[PDB]
Amino acid sequence: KETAAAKFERQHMDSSTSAASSSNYCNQMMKSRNLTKDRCKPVNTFVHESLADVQAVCSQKNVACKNGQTNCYQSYSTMSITDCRETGSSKYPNCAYKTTQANKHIIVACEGNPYVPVHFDASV
Q1: How many folded domains does the chain comprise?
Q2: In which domain, by residue range, is 110 found?
Q3: Do 82 and 26 contact (CB within 8 A), yes or no?
Q4: 119: annotated active-site residue
Q5: Distance (Å, rounded) from C-alpha 93 to C-alpha 73?
Q6: Where is the active site?
Q7: Which end of the chain has less neighbouring CB within 10 Å, N or C?
Q8: What is the domain-level CATH number for residue 121?
Q9: 44 annotated to bind ligand
Q10: Residue 10 known to bind ligand
């Protein structure tokens, strides 16, 4: 089955662009990454950084996750991200999203050996 680490890459990483380039970014990416196959995922964030820089967050500032777990880490630097949020016209299978650009610190949960991101917790 797909590993948690691979699922994080598929759901959250987009090293191929520096920022969202149009209002359609989320619509296209949510579909292409298979995030709308079974239902419209309501929210998602994409990170426009190298994979190595995001993996490195697991060695940065340890913080509590939103749900209280203690395997979360906050990046020391801000990163280029895109927030995708379902719009009012979204209706499966025609899932529709608003694209918002941001530059924020990321918080991820890490697991494993090698110890890598498996969950995107928040941006701050």
Answers
A1: 1
A2: 1-124
A3: yes
A4: yes
A5: 34
A6: 12, 119
A7: N
A8: 3.10.130.10
A9: yes
A10: yes
